[PDB]
Design a binder for this molecule. Sequence first.
Ligand SMILES: OC[C@H]1O[C@H](O[C@H]2[C@H](O)[C@@H](O)[C@@H](O[C@H]3[C@H](O)[C@@H](O)[C@@H](O[C@H]4[C@H](O)[C@@H](O)[C@@H](O)O[C@@H]4CO)O[C@@H]3CO)O[C@@H]2CO)[C@H](O)[C@@H](O)[C@@H]1O
Ligand SMILES: OC[C@H]1O[C@H](O[C@H]2[C@H](O)[C@@H](O)[C@@H](O[C@H]3[C@H](O)[C@@H](O)[C@@H](O[C@H]4[C@H](O)[C@@H](O)[C@@H](O)O[C@@H]4CO)O[C@@H]3CO)O[C@@H]2CO)[C@H](O)[C@@H](O)[C@@H]1O
Ligand SMILES: OC[C@H]1O[C@H](O[C@H]2[C@H](O)[C@@H](O)[C@@H](O[C@H]3[C@H](O)[C@@H](O)[C@@H](O)O[C@@H]3CO)O[C@@H]2CO)[C@H](O)[C@@H](O)[C@@H]1O
Ligand SMILES: OC[C@H]1O[C@H](O[C@H]2[C@H](O)[C@@H](O)[C@@H](O)O[C@@H]2CO)[C@H](O)[C@@H](O)[C@@H]1O
Ligand SMILES: [Mg+2]
Ligand SMILES: [Mg+2]
Length: 755
Amino acid sequence: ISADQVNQIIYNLHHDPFEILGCHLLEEGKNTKKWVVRAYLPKAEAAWVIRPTERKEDPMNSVHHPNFFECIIETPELNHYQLKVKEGEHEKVIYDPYAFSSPYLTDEDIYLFSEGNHHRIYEKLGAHVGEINGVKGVYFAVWAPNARNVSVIGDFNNWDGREHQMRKRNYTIWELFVPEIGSGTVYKYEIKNSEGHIYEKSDPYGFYREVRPNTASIVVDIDNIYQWHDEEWLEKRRNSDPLKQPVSVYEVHLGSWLHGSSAEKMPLLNGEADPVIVSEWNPGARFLSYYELAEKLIPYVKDMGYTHIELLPIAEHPFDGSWGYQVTGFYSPTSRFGRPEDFMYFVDKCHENGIGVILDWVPGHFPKDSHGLAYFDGTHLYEHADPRIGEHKEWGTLVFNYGRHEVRNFLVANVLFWFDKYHVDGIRVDAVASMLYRNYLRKEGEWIANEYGGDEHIEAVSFIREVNTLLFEYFPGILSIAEESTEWEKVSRPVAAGGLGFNLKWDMGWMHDMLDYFNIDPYFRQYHQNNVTFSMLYYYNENFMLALSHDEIVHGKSNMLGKMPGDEWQKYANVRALFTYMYTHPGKKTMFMSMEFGQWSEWNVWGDLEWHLLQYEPHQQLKQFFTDLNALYQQEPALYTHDFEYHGFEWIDCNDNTHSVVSFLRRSDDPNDSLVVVCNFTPQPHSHYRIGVPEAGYYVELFNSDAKQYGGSNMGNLGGKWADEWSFHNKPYSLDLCLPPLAVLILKLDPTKVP
Ligand SMILES: OC[C@H]1O[C@H](O[C@H]2[C@H](O)[C@@H](O)[C@@H](O[C@H]3[C@H](O)[C@@H](O)[C@@H](O[C@H]4[C@H](O)[C@@H](O)[C@@H](O)O[C@@H]4CO)O[C@@H]3CO)O[C@@H]2CO)[C@H](O)[C@@H](O)[C@@H]1O
Ligand SMILES: OC[C@H]1O[C@H](O[C@H]2[C@H](O)[C@@H](O)[C@@H](O[C@H]3[C@H](O)[C@@H](O)[C@@H](O[C@H]4[C@H](O)[C@@H](O)[C@@H](O)O[C@@H]4CO)O[C@@H]3CO)O[C@@H]2CO)[C@H](O)[C@@H](O)[C@@H]1O
Ligand SMILES: OC[C@H]1O[C@H](O[C@H]2[C@H](O)[C@@H](O)[C@@H](O[C@H]3[C@H](O)[C@@H](O)[C@@H](O)O[C@@H]3CO)O[C@@H]2CO)[C@H](O)[C@@H](O)[C@@H]1O
Ligand SMILES: OC[C@H]1O[C@H](O[C@H]2[C@H](O)[C@@H](O)[C@@H](O)O[C@@H]2CO)[C@H](O)[C@@H](O)[C@@H]1O
Ligand SMILES: [Mg+2]
Ligand SMILES: [Mg+2]
């Protein structure tokens, strides 16, 4: 490019910047092509073009002006790129604003979609505000290849679309522009299928929806509704390895954490809506908005010291009682709590406060509701046609046809959409086995094996691998967490190594072993020391997340206090010891709302939590306990830098099963950061209990779960204890400790203390 052209841009004289900025084809070679990407980035010193799916980065060069950049690249296709932009001492990574000239679908969009590789298809399918033939309006587009006809109905043409029939392209997608409408437009697709039947559909790619039980999509100007402030959090994230950091997750269901009064409007970010009543049986109550949650949940979590909040699914879902796990608007956060910009604000505020957001994501299935994806075009479009792989009969839901391109695409782009539009920091997938197995909850003769006569759902495995490969390339630094409950190997290993490519995996064995263990009367725990120690046998085959989740405190399993034997005192003690052990045991942490203040009742998704218990001392004390524990966790490198290396852990001794005592070391990079942890899992204190340590000196008591400030009896070692040169458990030195009742101690050597 020339200097006159550059200057036209800099001084805003150019007639159409899309001719020059963006990605443009320079020439076609035999095997590859030459492209140029250009960007005008005022205030940027430097820039790069990222080709995330090829795993490449190329620098851009200033040309004629220091903020006008060009990059020339040779590669056959150049569909997927990002700009990395450096403004002084900060870097951001963004999609190229000048990537798409036109709001309508191109031949390139359609081709890519048909191959299943349009990672940004949501920019073109759905509904977008736009200009065509010189007129402001909305462009609508929708995949329905076997439909006979499709129209658009809504407020603007009183729900009759005779004059708004849509043009069908490449025998696959239906499109239409409508002038003079804008965001807020309420609408659906009127589809007539191959048999004359004329059903209505919510927009599969729609970005906002009416409040359940209504289901009309609403048009959002999604790139012009909210102003972010999280550049620095995003940079820190992209350049960090979250597996070597502390990660204590507070799991939350937004609809049932706290309610407000339905006798008032729900405040939003600079606005307000009509309240959404939580149910007809509790009509005095409403949900809080994303906005109100940003104001109440976030500082509450900040205070507790958790690093992350994980949300049960917020994609639009018709029925509260599904907990979110039956989704019908995969491209919108639920209107129960307000608008897309309100959730943006929620995520932005988390980031301002140093807190990550993880979303439960549900690509495994979708319900039969007729507003949604089922039998979409009058065929089995999204679901597999054959119910032996296309239906989950015990759930009454449909399974996505992962081998169908436009379906894979819908899902692969969907996961990316949450990281792109809403800046989230991780996803989790419930019930991964349900995707992995052709025989999932099906008995002999109602399932067909794969090609090679195995149980493996081959299209599913391959969708999962692609999803995770892509996520980490596009947004390095995120968490992709799985719960897979069948011993399937290499879940949290990279696709390269024959993994499924998640980076963390819930340890469900550890959860069963610990809750089974703590549920036994202390006296009999001697018969079950292996519950305590077994998880470390297979521990290194995966990167484990220690999760004690919402699933474990419903449907008659009790909340955590109620799982524990003994009187009130011993019940809180057992909670303290279990969670102290959890936070010291290798792996990342997840725990569910209500557990941190000792709720008695099971989680009830129709009400809110029992906040009034925080008026009382024991509940307050338990909450302080968790507050200090999270504070410690963040503060002590040995508790997070080496969760997943052998160096990070070693048992000191685990043979005293008679007193249900175990002890171990955690280590980090610096050996002065090493910690000694000792657990006493009965209410029998011990008085001169000897534990091998590996160096001499004063070991400070960093933490003692029996402290009276936490509800304990206050037995302890009075701040710490000098080692003895008295060999024990194969170690040169040893400590002669008080073990408080039902309690855990964390000690560290202070190698500069006065002998
Ligand atoms: O200080 C003198 C005593 O110190 C040591 O006692 C220990 C116990 O060995 C531990 O078990 C624990 O006691 C708990 C007890 O387990 C629990 O059930 C509960 O008992 C209460 C009970 O709630 C109440 O209704 C009534 O029975 O009074 C009891 C209070 O003592 O709560 C106890 C904790 O308060 O911790 C204590 C104190 O550190 C030592 O072992 C004893 O020999 C000694 O007498
Ligand atoms: O009565 C007061 C007594 O207090 C002290 O004894 C303690 C020890 O300090 C503790 O460490 C523990 O003993 C455990 C021991 O730690 C554990 O390893 C296991 O020992 C097995 C051993 O592993 C096995 O290889 C073999 O050698 O037999 C050993 C003996 O069982 O189990 C021990 C407990 O059964 O608790 C005791 C108290 O019971 C103090 O040092 C004693 O001298 C004092 O009498
Ligand atoms: O004030 C009138 C009315 O407004 C609201 O109803 C809207 C619906 O929620 C919305 O879905 C839409 O309804 C259409 C269906 O989705 C569609 O499938 C088809 O059958 O036509 C319907 C419209 O005729 O539009 C209505 C109308 O605005 C609000 O929910 C009502 O309480 C209120 O009565
Ligand atoms: O053009 C017919 C048909 O083609 C596409 O389907 C692919 C399918 O996605 C693959 O998994 C594989 O089985 O081959 C098919 C033919 O290429 C579309 O998915 C479909 O809508 C369309 O009508
Ligand atoms: Mg499950
Ligand atoms: Mg309540």
